């Protein structure tokens, strides 16, 4: 599924990402746009051998288990083929685990370079 901007914000806010670890809601929406284009099924295979899955591009070497990725830690205790749902529950829940503090969104390079310090609230404006 491909989410709309306000559809994703509303979903994410219900799931408690609004201000999670002092990260305002626009941060997460901004990160999803660049990472997955709001596409719950985006998958991108990395030259490092891992693959990134879902609306939040969760990694197969560290956070989820795809079965084809050597050195698999699967710290979110969830198969990657579960992070591709139309419900974002599994993806939000793994994101909550990944970001353990106020530097945690730096887990997404796209957020780091594109969204950090900009007017992220722009992303929820009108919702």
């Amino acid at each position: 599924k491909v989410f709309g901007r306000c559809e994703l914000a509303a979903a994410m806010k219900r799931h408690g990402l609004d201000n999670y670890r002092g990260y305002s809601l626009g941060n997460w929406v901004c990160a999803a746009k660049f990472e997955s284009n709001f596409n719950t099924q985006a998958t991108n295979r990395n030259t490092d051998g891992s693959t990134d899955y879902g609306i939040l591009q969760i990694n197969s070497r560290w956070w989820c288990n795809d079965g084809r990725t050597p050195g698999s830690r699967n710290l979110c205790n969830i198969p990657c083929s579960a992070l591709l749902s139309s419900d974002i529950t599994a993806s939000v829940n793994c994101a909550k685990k990944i970001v353990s503090d106020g530097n945690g969104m730096n887990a997404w390079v796209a957020w780091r370079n594109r969204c950090k310090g900009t007017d992220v609230q722009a992303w929820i404006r009108g919702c």
């Epitope: 491909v2 989410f3 709309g4 901007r5 306000c6 559809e7 746009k33 660049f34 284009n37 709001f38 596409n39 796209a110 594109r114 007017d119 722009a122 404006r125 009108g126 919702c127």
Partner: T-cell receptor
């Protein structure tokens, strides 16, 4: 798709446009101005947030499903909702 | 803002021809680039989302590619109903910005 119906479709006028969404879009409604064979230019974001450079005679209003743009400026005007996939435009007012 | 440069400005070709339109963003916008089709008398309509995702009902002769700064829309078999102006639009940074458009005509 969320259908954006503008009215009226055309207007003659010498030196108020409506847009209606089929579904509740809250305030996620943008206004665009297009001159002939030119690209659309964004005038208003999120119902009423004017873009920098756009004069104050252009104001915007509304929430939910019924919205208004308020008026060199002979052009087509388009509403566009960008809160729900796929982003859609109304058919325009000339 | 981000400045989109689109080319060519117009083109004309024959039924069945392959045609390609390019869009260059003034900085890296990843895949946050859409293509709109505006038929005469009509509003712009989303044809391709995020560089390559075809919208439903759009025929498979249309496609798009690119990620970063340079993007392309290809019509693999031009048809008379494609008579339109095509716009790229980056929607990754506020405010959303359009290319200048490409009028496509069919002999």
């Amino acid at each position: 798709d969320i259908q954006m119906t503008q009215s009226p479709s055309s207007l003659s006028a010498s030196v108020t446009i409506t847009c209606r969404a089929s579904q509740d879009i809250a305030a996620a409604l943008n206004w665009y101005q297009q001159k002939p064979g030119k690209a659309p230019k964004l005038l208003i974001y999120a119902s009423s947030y004017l873009q920098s450079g756009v004069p104050s005679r252009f104001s915007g209003s509304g929430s939910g499903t019924d919205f208004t743009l308020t008026i060199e400026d002979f052009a087509t005007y388009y509403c566009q909702q960008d809160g729900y996939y796929p982003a859609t435009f109304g058919q325009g007012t000339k | 803002d981000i400045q989109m440069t689109q080319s060519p400005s117009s083109l004309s070709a024959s039924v069945g021809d392959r045609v390609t339109i390019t869009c260059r963003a003034s900085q890296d916008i990843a895949a946050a680039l859409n293509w709109y089709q505006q038929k005469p008398g009509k509003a712009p309509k989303l044809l391709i989302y995020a560089s390559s995702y075809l919208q439903s009902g759009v025929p498979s002769r249309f496609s798009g590619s690119g990620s970063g700064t340079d993007f392309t829309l290809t019509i693999s078999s031009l048809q008379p109903e494609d008579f339109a102006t095509y716009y790229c639009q980056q929607d990754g940074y506020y405010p959303a910005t359009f290319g200048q458009g490409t009028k496509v005509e069919i002999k």
